[PDB]
Structure formats: structure tokens, C-alpha cells
From a paper:
We determined the crystal structure of [name] in complex with [name]*07:02 presenting a self-peptide derived from histone H3 (RL9, residues 40–48, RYRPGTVAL). The crystal lattice contained two ternary complexes in the asymmetric unit that were highly similar (root mean square deviation (r.m.s.d.) <0.4 Å over all Cα positions), and accordingly, one copy of the complex was used for analysis. This arrangement placed the KIR D1 domain over the [name] α1-helix that was bound via three [name] loops, A-B, C-C′ and E-F, with canonical contacts to the [name]-lineage defining Asn80 by the C-C′ residue Lys44. The [name]-I α2-helix was recognised via two loops of the D2 domain; the B-C loop spanning Ser132 to Asp135 and the F-F′ loop that spans Phe181 to Glu187 as well as the D1-D2 interdomain loop. Comparing the structure of [name]-[name]*07:02-RL9 with the previously determined structure of [name]-[name]*03:04-GL9 (PDB accession code 1EFX24) revealed very similar docking modes. Namely, [name] made more unique contacts to [name]*07:02. Specifically, Pro20C*07:02 interacted with Phe45KIR2DL2, Val76C*07:02 interacted with and Lys44KIR2DL2 and Glu187KIR2DL2 and Lys146C*07:02 and Ala149 C*07:02 contacted Glu187KIR2DL2 and Tyr134KIR2DL2, respectively. Taken together, [name] used the same framework of D1 and D2 residues to recognise subtly different regions on these distinct [name] allotypes, with the twist angle providing the basis of the differences between these two ternary [name]-pHLA-C complexes.
The closely related inhibitory killer-cell immunoglobulin-like receptors (KIR), [name] and [name], regulate the activation of natural killer cells (NK) by interacting with the human leukocyte antigen-C1 ([name]-C1) group of molecules.
Residue numbers in the entry:
A (entry chain B): 0 to 98
B (entry chain A): 2 to 226, 232 to 277
C (entry chain D): 6 to 56, 59 to 84, 87 to 142, 146 to 200
D (entry chain C): 1 to 9
């Protein structure tokens, strides 16, 4: 039973601008076991309408998965992803850099 | 640079109940099939509009294979959980990678069938497609059960021919999706790293396929030398370089892609 | 009372093959259900039909996760289940390299002579099983010339018939190999 | 296509 710390990336499909509907992507990679609780959130609370990719792994047998949702990027609204895993002593929330 | 890669994962839950099975297939950089044991009625789903044109018996036979391998992997979880004397406490994982890489000709170059238990390599098909490698004695019991079934013979027939033939067929059918390219939409970012240090990142976004050459050049020569899914079938790759702050006019990011006739020179224009 | 379970056409099942576990009783149960104990347990609900009452449970296509010990139960309407029928150990065969089945001194023998059946395979089987004249279970010697062998001295129980034998491993007493070349023993 | 159905490990 070898645990692997997940690596989180909170990005988007296109570099954002307002007036452009975009997709927020929360991509987790390099973790083990496959049981991971991931949920995106806008301005504090969770988004309940989200879909993800199908699970696979890499050549080191570490899994990776991608969640995504529709949104518009505004200057008044923040975005972040909440990730819980057995290797985490706490559910880590990572903010969406506008980079 | 052509491959058919199948990735399989079965997770055993603590106690009674079917371990969840899942299997995805990739042709090159595109996922094109998927199967999930825990559907309302589990069957083999397409993942691209260029395999939907395959006949009914194709999807039928495929789905049947997926079911048989599902039950085989659940039983495998049972036996493996019996091989190390691990009681009902503990949820387990079992993974298998089965694929083929084509050669410079229309014939096989490499065959893969690897199996890992709970993260570490367990048993693997040797490169000759006739021998096996076991990680411990339990995988030697597995090795005996597998040699008694002659799965290396079946599999050698699969990789040699069936994997290659259907690889060529998928390439031909989906050359309007796989053998086409997507040029990258670029941008360059700059972050302060320290007092005299600054980091430049050459972002290439929304491109297909994955093969891309990003090089930082100071005036003249190379300086440097990952990707992530954009979500629509494309990727994103950034190339980092650490330069002395106040000297970023010299460093330029050169970029070569399949969809690019001439390479792109990209300097940091903060506008 | 108990119901009455049996197999059609037999208790042994090749891979990719379907069997019919028939559970019949005289109590006139309106409901039946069939439970498998093994590596992965299961239950199946079905309706009782009054020909005597009976249900025909269609199992298959047989795979490693469907072999095991089976017991059926009868009920009325909600459920009011019966005492379990006699168990029945459905076995999966056709998964491994078939052993060889030789005879000593030969297949056909004189009347008044005994026969010993030998199952030998290059595959490293732990146990070997013998049918049918589906009962005989012996263990396998480790190596001769790289082969694994089990010997069934039939002694006083030699009357002839078609004989097949299978190889199996000890962790999976329900997973058996292909049938050997069936050998007809005649008491000429 | 997908690998042939094999025995349990």
C-alpha cells in the first residue's frame, strides 16, 4: 500500500477574458490510490453540476483525472478547486491563477 | 510514433461487492473507447465519432471481451488478496497496460502487457512476447496459472497481428481526426523569482498532437532542454527558463510543431 | 421443507457455456431464489411454475466468477424463504492447457484386470480430477522430465466408460483446465 | 481492438 501525493493544476481552456465563455479545468495527476474527492468551487461554495474524464494512469502507474465546467471569468469572482486524498492530512483548496 | 494503448483498472472495495472495473483505449493521443462495470447496464461506449462507424458485431464482440476481462479482474482481486493473507480490511487496486507500438513499416515494433498490484509492478510480459517477469513469489503462482493457460501465445498472436492490423485500420478510418494537426495558440508569461532572477514561461495552448518542440534561446543558442489536457482533445505545454531580471529582451522562445510550416519566434511583449 | 436443485446437462461447465440449474419442489412455491456462495456470492429471484412446482435458472455464459456452491430456496409471495436445498458445486472448466490421460497397462483390458489412469501435463497443476464412468480427486507429483502427474489406481472400481481428467490449482478448486482427450476404457 | 479475454491472475 504505497500512497502517492496528487499534483493539482487549476487552469482553463483558453487564457481568459470577460465576454468569453470558458472552461475551468481542475487536473489532478500522479497519485495513488485512485480514490480522490475532487470538486470545483466558485466564490467559496461547491459547484454541483460538473463532469470529468475517464480514469487512467501513467507509465509509473500513477493515476490522473480531469474535471471541467463552464463559467465566465470575471474580476469580481474567484475560482478554486478542492481536492481530498488519503495522502492529504487535509482537503487542499488551490486557487485559479489568471495565468 | 503510432500506438494503441489500453489502460485497465479494477478497485476492490472492503468486504463484499463487485470491485469496480474500468478500461480506456487510446490511439496515439486520442481516447476512442471506454468501458465501466458500474453502469446501470455496463457496455462498451465509444469516445470519438470515427469508431461509431464500426459495425454492430464489432461493438458486440468488444463489449463481451470487456465483460469477461471485468470478471477476470474481480476474481484476480480475490486471489491476490488471498496470496498475501490480507483480511477484509483494505481496499485494493489492480492495473494493466496492454498496447502495441508500430514500427517504421506497417508491422509491429513493440508489445506491452504490464500488470501492477496496489501501485508496484506485479507481473509483466517479456519483450519477446513469450516469457514473463514476476515481482515476488505470489506473481510466480500467477506465472504458473498464466503459463498453464498459455496466455503468452494468445497475446503474442494479438500483438503481432490483430493490434497492428486494427491500428492501421483506425489510422486509416480516423486520418481526418488523428493524422491532422492543430497549431498552438501561444502566450508568454513572466514571474519574478527573486531579486536578480525572473522566470519566463512559453505557453503553447490548444494544439494537436502532443509532439512539440519548445526551446528557449538566449541570443544564439539553446538554454533549455509538462503537457496537460485542454479538455477538448488538445493539450497545453509550457517551457520555463530562468533569466536575470531586466535581461528578458535577449531570450526568445522558438517553437516547432507539426501544424507549423516555419518555427515561431516568441519574445516577451508585456502588452 | 427443502427444494430440489440439479444441473442440466451437468455439474461441470466449459467456459462460454450456459447451464440450467433446475430447482423443483412439491410444496407449490410461487417464488424461488438461487444463491451462490464462493469467491463472489450472489442471489437470483425467479417465479415458480406448477407443471409439481419448479424454476429453471439459466446460468451463463460460465466464467471464473460464476463457479461455486449453489443452494436454492422456495418462498410464497415480501418473502418467506424455505430451508436450503442440497448444495451443488458448479465447476468452471476449459481455462488451461488440457492434461494427458494415459492408461496402464492399457485402455482396454481383460475381464478380471485393473486399470490405472495417469494424468500428466507440462503445466504445473496442483490437483487432478477424474470423471465419469465426476468424483475422483488426487494430487500431482512435482517433476519427472518437467511434467506433473497424478495416478488414479482404480483397483476394484474399473468397469469402463469414457474418462476425462482436468488440472486445477489449490487456491481455485473450482477453476479446472480443458478436458483431456477422452479415453474410453472397455472391459474386453 | 481490445486484448483477448484471459484467465484470472
Amino acid at each position: 500500500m504505497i500512497q502517492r501525493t496528487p499534483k493539482i493544476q487549476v487552469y482553463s481552456r483558453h487564457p481568459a477574458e470577460n465576454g468569453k465563455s470558458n472552461f475551468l479545468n481542475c487536473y489532478v495527476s500522479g497519485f495513488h490510490p485512485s480514490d480522490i474527492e475532487v470538486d470545483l468551487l466558485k466564490n467559496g461554495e461547491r459547484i454541483e453540476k460538473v463532469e470529468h474524464s475517464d480514469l487512467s494512469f501513467s507509465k509509473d502507474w500513477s493515476f490522473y483525472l480531469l474535471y471541467y465546467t463552464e463559467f465566465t471569468p470575471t474580476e469580481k469572482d474567484e475560482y478554486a478547486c478542492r481536492v481530498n486524498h488519503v495522502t492529504l492530512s487535509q482537503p487542499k483548496i488551490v486557487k485559479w491563477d489568471r495565468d | 510514433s503510432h500506438s494503441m494503448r489500453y489502460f485497465d483498472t479494477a478497485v476492490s472495495r472492503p468486504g463484499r461487492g463487485e470491485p469496480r472495473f474500468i478500461s480506456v483505449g487510446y490511439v496515439d493521443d486520442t481516447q476512442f473507447v471506454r468501458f465501466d462495470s458500474d453502469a446501470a447496464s455496463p457496455r462498451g461506449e465509444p469516445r470519438a465519432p470515427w469508431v461509431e462507424q464500426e459495425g454492430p458485431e464489432y461493438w458486440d464482440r468488444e463489449t463481451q471481451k470487456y465483460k469477461r476481462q471485468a470478471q477476470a479482474d474481480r476474481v484476480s482481486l480475490r486471489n491476490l488478496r488471498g496470496y498475501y493473507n490480507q483480511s477484509e480490511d483494505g481496499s485494493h487496486t489492480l492495473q494493466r497496460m496492454s498496447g502495441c507500438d508500430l514500427g517504421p513499416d506497417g508491422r509491429l515494433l513493440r508489445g506491452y502487457d504490464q500488470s501492477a498490484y496496489d501501485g508496484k509492478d506485479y507481473i509483466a510480459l517479456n519483450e519477446d512476447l513469450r516469457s514473463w517477469t514476476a515481482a515476488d513469489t505470489a506473481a510466480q503462482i500467477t506465472q504458473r496459472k498464466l503459463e498453464a493457460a498459455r496466455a503468452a501465445e494468445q497475446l503474442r498472436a494479438y500483438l503481432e497481428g490483430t493490434c497492428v492490423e486494427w491500428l492501421r485500420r483506425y489510422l486509416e478510418n480516423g486520418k481526418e481526426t488523428l493524422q491532422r494537426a492543430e497549431p498552438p495558440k501561444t502566450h508568454v508569461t513572466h514571474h519574478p523569482l527573486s531579486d536578480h532572477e525572473a522566470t519566463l514561461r512559453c505557453w503553447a495552448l490548444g494544439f494537436y498532437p502532443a509532439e512539440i518542440t519548445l526551446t528557449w534561446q538566449r541570443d544564439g543558442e539553446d538554454q533549455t532542454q509538462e503537457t496537460r489536457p485542454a479538455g477538448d482533445g488538445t493539450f497545453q505545454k509550457w517551457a520555463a527558463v530562468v533569466v536575470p531580471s531586466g535581461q528578458e529582451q535577449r531570450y526568445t522562445c522558438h517553437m516547432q510543431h507539426e501544424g507549423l510550416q516555419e518555427p515561431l519566434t516568441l519574445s516577451w511583449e508585456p502588452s | 421443507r427443502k427444494p430440489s436443485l440439479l444441473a442440466h446437462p451437468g455439474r461441470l461447465v466449459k467456459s462460454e457455456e450456459t447451464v440450467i440449474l433446475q430447482c423443483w419442489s412439491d410444496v407449490r412455491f410461487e417464488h424461488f431464489l438461487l444463491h451462490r456462495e464462493g469467491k463472489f456470492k450472489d442471489t437470483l429471484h425467479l417465479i415458480g411454475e406448477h407443471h409439481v412446482s419448479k424454476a429453471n435458472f439459466s446460468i451463463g455464459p460460465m466464467m471464473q466468477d460464476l463457479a461455486g456452491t449453489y443452494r436454492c430456496y422456495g418462498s410464497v409471495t415480501p418473502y418467506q424463504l424455505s430451508a436450503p436445498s442440497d448444495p451443488l458445486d458448479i465447476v468452471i472448466t476449459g481455462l488451461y492447457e488440457k492434461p494427458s490421460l494415459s492408461a496402464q497397462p492399457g485402455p482396454t483390458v481383460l475381464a478380471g484386470e485393473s486399470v490405472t489412469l495417469s494424468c500428466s501435463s507440462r503445466s504445473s497443476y496442483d490437483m487432478y480430477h477424474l470423471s465419469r464412468e465426476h468424483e475422483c480427486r488426487f494430487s500431482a507429483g512435482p517433476k519427472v522430465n518437467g511434467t506433473f502427474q497424478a495416478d488414479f489406481p482404480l483397483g476394484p472400481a474399473t468397469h469402463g466408460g469414457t474418462y476425462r481428467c482436468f488440472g486445477s490449482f489449490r487456491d481455485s478448486p473450482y477453476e479446472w483446465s480443458n478436458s483431456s482427450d477422452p479415453l474410453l476404457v472397455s472391459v474386453i | 481492438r481490445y486484448r483477448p479475454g484471459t484467465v484470472a491472475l
